[PDB]
Amino acid sequence: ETQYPVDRYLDWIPSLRASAATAATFAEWVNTSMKTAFDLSDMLLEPL
C-alpha cells in the first residue's frame, strides 16, 4: 500500500498487510531466484 497508484486486479487473491520486513524477505527470495536464474555466483543488489 503506497501513495503512488498501481493497478492490482488480483487484490481478491488473499494477502494480509505485510510489514516492510515481510515484503523485504519476499523480495530477497525474488533476488536469490534471479541470481540462480542468471546463474549469478556474485552478490546481487545485496545493499538493496
Next chain:
Amino acid sequence: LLEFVLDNLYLNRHTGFSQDHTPFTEGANLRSLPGPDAEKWYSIMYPT
C-alpha cells in the same frame, strides 16, 4: 519514593526482536530474551 527511584537506577541493554509467525499479533518483532519461557513475557506483552 526515594528508594523506588534508587531501585530504578538501571541502564537497559539493547535487546533483540523476533517477527510474529502467528495471526494472533500482526507479525510484530518481539523483544527476545535469551533462554526459554519468555513466551509468558511475550503473552503478557501482547495479550492479543
